[PDB]
Amino acid sequence: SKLPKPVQDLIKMIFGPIDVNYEKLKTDIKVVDRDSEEAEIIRKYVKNTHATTHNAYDLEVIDIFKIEREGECQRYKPFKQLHNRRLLWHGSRTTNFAGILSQGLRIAPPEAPVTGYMFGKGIYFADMVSKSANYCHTSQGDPIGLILLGEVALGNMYELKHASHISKLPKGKHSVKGLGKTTPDPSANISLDGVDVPLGTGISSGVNDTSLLYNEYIVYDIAQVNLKYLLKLKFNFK
Ligand SMILES: NC(=O)c1ccc[n+]([C@@H]2C[C@H](COP(=O)(O)OP(=O)(O)OC[C@H]3O[C@@H](n4cnc5c(N)ncnc54)[C@H](O)[C@@H]3O)[C@@H](O)[C@H]2O)c1
Numbered sequence: 001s002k003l004p005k006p007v008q009d010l011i012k013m014i015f016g017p018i019d020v021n022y023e024k025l026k027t028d029i030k031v032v033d034r035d036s037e038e039a040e041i042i043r044k045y046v047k048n049t050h051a052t053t054h055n056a057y058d059l060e061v062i063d064i065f066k067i068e069r070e071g072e073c074q075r076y077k078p079f080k081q082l083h084n085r086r087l088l089w090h091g092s093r094t095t096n097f098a099g100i101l102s103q104g105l106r107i108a109p110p111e112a113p114v115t116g117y118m119f120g121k122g123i124y125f126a127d128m129v130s131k132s133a134n135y136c137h138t139s140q141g142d143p144i145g146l147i148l149l150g151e152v153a154l155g156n157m158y159e160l161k162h163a164s165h166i167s168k169l170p171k172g173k174h175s176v177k178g179l180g181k182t183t184p185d186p187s188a189n190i191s192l193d194g195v196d197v198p199l200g201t202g203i204s205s206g207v208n209d210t211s212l213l214y215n216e217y218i219v220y221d222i223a224q225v226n227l228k229y230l231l232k233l234k235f236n237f238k
């Protein structure tokens, strides 16, 4: 293998021959320098947006990968120009990442149940790491998860406070935002490349009439997502 050690570790973690398996991911994975601006930013995101409700554990960033799905960049060219694009968390079971890296983040299939969703079958994201982290489904005896940072082309958000079974966005709208009671401090946002990064500490959003504790973001076209980073997270349960 001609791949940095942290990558090879990742490959096995996902599958369960390495070089053959990297070709199957159809993804260009690179290790982000620990002392770089990217890493300093990404770790600052992970620190500040770890939520008080999620006292079950601390997070430590083991490795940061700069993923670049083959063909995804071109697919996202339409929405690349769209305004208000954010870098957001998406957590999933480690078993899935084989598909997620090869096929990209997809919508929950037709066969799946629709009743379970707050804002319908779409691709959900969070601006709070601890929210997404919970979907890694890490446990005491398996405390290493994988978590995505997607560039999400949100555009004009349909900002809802309450469960809405959506099958069509209002005209002008390209995304839904569930308004949480607690939000990454908006005055402490920073812009990495062209993308907004809501990495401020959690403060009260000022929204009183909402059922959510934290924000969440939904998009109903797979093309609106561009996967940027892939973090290897150590869950330190209390
Ligand atoms: N993720 C789920 O589908 C789900 C379902 C049931 C309970 N819970 C628990 C409730 C609690 C929420 O924590 P956290 O995610 O940090 O808080 P949060 O308030 O930021 O998010 C609440 C979560 O529940 C979902 N949700 C809220 N209201 C509805 C609704 N009316 N219909 C369908 N889905 C809805 C919402 O989409 C989001 O994922 C945790 O203990 C969760 O594990 C989660």
Ligand SMILES: NC(=O)c1cccc([C@@H]2O[C@H](COP(=O)(O)OP(=O)(O)OC[C@H]3O[C@@H](n4cnc5c(N)ncnc54)[C@H](O)[C@@H]3O)[C@@H](O)[C@H]2O)c1
Pocket: 089, 090, 091, 092, 093, 096, 099, 100, 101, 103, 104, 105, 106, 107, 108, 116, 117, 118, 119, 122, 124, 125, 126, 131, 132, 133, 135, 216, 217
């Ligand atoms: N997932 C979160 O980080 C998250 C963020 C904010 C809020 C929430 C809250 O959880 C609710 C559900 O969220 P969930 O993302 O699990 O969506 P759901 O549709 O039920 O689950 C499908 C799973 O399939 C994964 N996957 C994506 N691409 C592929 C692929 N090519 N091959 C295989 N698997 C793939 C995907 O990551 C997800 O785990 C949602 O309604 C909401 O209340 C989650």
